Design a protein around this ligand. Structure first.
Ligand SMILES: NC(=O)c1ccc[n+]([C@@H]2O[C@H](COP(=O)([O-])OP(=O)(O)OC[C@H]3O[C@@H](n4cnc5c(N)ncnc54)[C@H](O)[C@@H]3O)[C@@H](O)[C@H]2O)c1
Ligand SMILES: *C(=O)CCCCCCCCCCCCC
Ligand SMILES: [Zn+2]
Lengths: 6, 292
């Protein structure tokens, strides 16, 4: 599952 | 085929289109700007924004407080911040209720929200209407993989106001709100719903987000090329499916409306002849909340 990032 | 379905790249355009028989399936994408009227600060606004208001938590930098690995080694800044920010009252905005009315009018396929304030559920959106893309403060879990004890809001609130850092009563592992901290995986539902929903979407309605958080931001370019996209924001976002082209020779489906999300929703309500119905919805529901 790809990932929370700015 | 990059077809054209908006007659004009204005909010009247979008309204007429919304009144067409074709427009049956709306997706909302929302962020922190839709709750600023309810007294919750966003990150990016100046002086008021959260990234200009953390200095007094002695962090490596502002962003760190919301980072999963920093939270893990030191959860205290976050929980002290949670106490500073914890609202006296959870009262959804007009923007919120504008999506409630979509649901009521049969037009809401989904709301994809970045907020963790639960105002959407409170405003009447059922679980099935929602993808909480950054999770929720409503429930919490201990971080031990093999325990994963749920704890209620009240337990978590007790602890916060007590200035006690939440520890699992059983295993002693740190207890985290079911928020998706930066560095975390987004929930399973997000990707699965995005596979199903964007093949039925007649209109994208994007409100109060700077579209800098991934992979939520890219949702815009999952839309069919012919699907019109309305932004309701103070500032233009989505520029850098393709990013938002508002203003160039090639523009064909994107509109920006620049102002407060509350103001925008009321204006669109107006064009649909919804203004009174929306006014009455806010009032009845606001009072029902004050009744508790
Ligand atoms: N309520 C919350 O849950 C909350 C609050 C603050 C931050 N956040 C987190 O911040 C992250 C950043 O994403 P974001 O884009 O939502 O926040 P952001 O601060 O990056 O951007 C918010 C956007 O809303 C605009 N805006 C602010 N107030 C507005 C108003 N009243 N009317 C119209 N537009 C308004 C700002 O100009 C900005 O473009 C998200 O991941 C979210 O989880 C959540
Ligand atoms: C996604 O960006 C993860 C970081 C979430 C930011 C949390 C901001 C919420 C501040 C309000 C206090 C909590 C009360 C529900
Ligand atoms: Zn535990």
């Amino acid at each position: 599952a790809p990932r929370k990032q700015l | 085929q990059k077809e054209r379905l908006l007659d004009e790249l204005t909010l009247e355009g979008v309204a007429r289109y919304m009144q067409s028989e074709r427009c049956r399936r709306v997706i909302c994408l929302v962020g922190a700007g839709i709750s600023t009227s309810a007294g919750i600060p966003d990150f990016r606004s100046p002086s008021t924004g959260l990234y200009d208001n953390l200095e007094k938590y002695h962090l490596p930098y502002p962003e760190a407080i919301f980072e999963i690995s920093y939270f893990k080694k030191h959860p205290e800044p976050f929980f002290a911040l949670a106490k500073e920010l914890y609202p006296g009252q959870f009262k959804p905005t007009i923007c919120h209720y504008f999506m409630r009315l979509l649901k009521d009018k049969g037009l809401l396929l989904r709301c994809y929200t970045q907020n963790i304030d639960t105002l959407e559920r409170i405003a009447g959106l059922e679980q099935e209407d929602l993808v909480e893309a950054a999770g929720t403060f409503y429930t919490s879990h201990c971080v031990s993989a093999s325990c994963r004890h749920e704890y209620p809001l009240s337990w978590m609130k007790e602890k916060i106001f007590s200035e006690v850092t939440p520890k699992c009563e059983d295993c002693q592992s740190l207890v985290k709100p079911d928020i998706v901290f930066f560095g975390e995986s987004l929930p399973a539902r997000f990707f699965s719903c995005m596979q199903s929903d964007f093949l039925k979407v007649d209109l994208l309605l994007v409100m109060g987000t700077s579209l800098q958080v991934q992979p939520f931001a890219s949702l815009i370019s999952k839309a069919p090329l012919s699907t019109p996209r309305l932004l309701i924001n103070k500032e233009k976002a989505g520029q850098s499916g393709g990013g938002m082209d508002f203003d160039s020779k090639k523009a064909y489906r994107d509109v920006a409306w620049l102002g407060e999300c509350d103001q925008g929703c009321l204006a669109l309500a107006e064009l649909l002849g919804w203004k009174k119905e929306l006014e009455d919805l806010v009032r009845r529901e606001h009072a029902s909340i004050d009744a508790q």
